Amino acid sequence: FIDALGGVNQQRAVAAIIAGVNNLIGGGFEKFFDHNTMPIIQPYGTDIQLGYYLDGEGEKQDRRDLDVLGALNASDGNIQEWMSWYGTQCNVAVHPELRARQSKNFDRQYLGNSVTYTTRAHRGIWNPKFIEALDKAIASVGLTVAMDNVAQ
């Protein structure tokens, strides 16, 4: 799924993925869209720093908690501090090392110093046509799924 994002073997990775869905449905993913016009996953650009922090009882919690609502509360409404952080997480014309350093500076000030970093990861966007084809192709071959939350 990562190589399907782009690079020397993107075509092979994409071929493997569309074959995998066709194996699920008995063929026909191709009746919904062209995978060579619509690559399966696009890059999100800003990559992911993973890690965890300890809470007040010493439990491990995901560092991703300082998300947009998280960061706004962490700065207690200081929008300028928020926007500096937010730009760090969005402007990807900025070399990732510079962004990583500022992201770590922000965790020490807002999350705390009890922060451990773990293996990093990529993020990408699933092509809306891949999604249409996967969901409809399964439903279209009769593998009906009921919603348990029938109304809210």
């Binding site: 990562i2 190589d3 994002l5 782009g6 690079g7 020397v8 073997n9 993107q10 092979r12 990775a13 493997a16 890059p43």
Partner: peptide, 12 residues
Amino acid sequence: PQFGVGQGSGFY
């Protein structure tokens, strides 16, 4: 901006 590729296998 670019995608590096490591030595994946089985699917290619």
